[PDB]
């Protein structure tokens, strides 16, 4: 069916783009909206309303480019916005070796049911946040299984 194919394409697009960016240590921050509206953070970014593709995600996060400075927010079947703000967690439990992208991913995860993916520009490690929890430096298998569980409904 249609939504099936879209959600699997979304997963593939996330997996391909973060693999590309992780090998090159390109920082990335991708938040996927679910039941909780994120329109109030979409409004802070540059509106794209674009089809989802691994290629567009990669191009967005290229450093020192107009769209890279913040978060991509995916809503339904579109890349809604780029360079968006996400709220920074105040948690002192988040390791000090992790940067602003991780703290923003943790922050949005505390106030929405979104699923947020981080690529670290320091390590290339991929992490995910959900419900105020951080899954740090996930494997490709782990990333795949989590995206399947959380994004295919
Ligand atoms: Na800690
Ligand atoms: Na954890």
Curated annotation (Swiss-Prot):
Knockout or disruption consequences: Essential, it cannot be deleted.
Entry cofactors: Co(2+)
Molecular function per GO: adenylate cyclase activity; ATP binding; diadenylate cyclase activity
Cofactor note: Optimal activity at 0.5-1 mM CoCl(2), also functions with Mn(2+), for a construct missing residues 1-80.
EC number: 2.7.7.85
Keyword Kinase belongs to the record: no
Limits of the DAC domain: 1-140
Keywords per UniProt: ATP-binding, Cell membrane, Membrane, Nucleotide-binding, Nucleotidyltransferase, Transferase, Transmembrane, Transmembrane helix
Subcellular location per the Swiss-Prot or TrEMBL entry: Cell membrane
Subunit and interaction comment: Homodimer, required for active site formation.
Protein name per Swiss-Prot or TrEMBL: Diadenylate cyclase
Source organism: Listeria monocytogenes serovar 1/2a (strain ATCC BAA-679 / EGD-e)
Lineage of producing organism: Bacteria, Bacillati, Bacillota, Bacilli, Bacillales
Residues of the full protein shown: 103 to 255 of 273
């Amino acid at each position: 069916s249609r939504i099936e194919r879209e959600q699997h394409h979304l997963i593939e697009s996330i997996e391909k783009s973060t693999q590309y960016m992780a090998k090159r240590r390109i920082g990335a921050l991708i938040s996927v909206a679910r039941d909780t509206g994120m329109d109030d953070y979409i409004e802070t970014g540059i509106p794209l309303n674009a089809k989802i593709s691994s290629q567009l995600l990669i191009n967005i996060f290229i450093p020192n480019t107009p769209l890279h400075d913040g978060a991509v927010i995916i809503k339904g079947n579109e890349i809604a916005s780029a360079a968006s703000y996400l709220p920074l967690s105040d948690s002192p439990f988040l390791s000090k070796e992790l940067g602003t992208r991780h703290r923003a991913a943790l922050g949005i995860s505390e106030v929405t049911d979104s699923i947020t993916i981080v690529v670290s520009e320091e390590t290339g490690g991929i992490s995910l946040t959900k419900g105020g929890e951080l899954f740090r430096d996930v494997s490709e298998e782990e990333l795949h299984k989590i995206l399947l569980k959380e994004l295919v409904t």
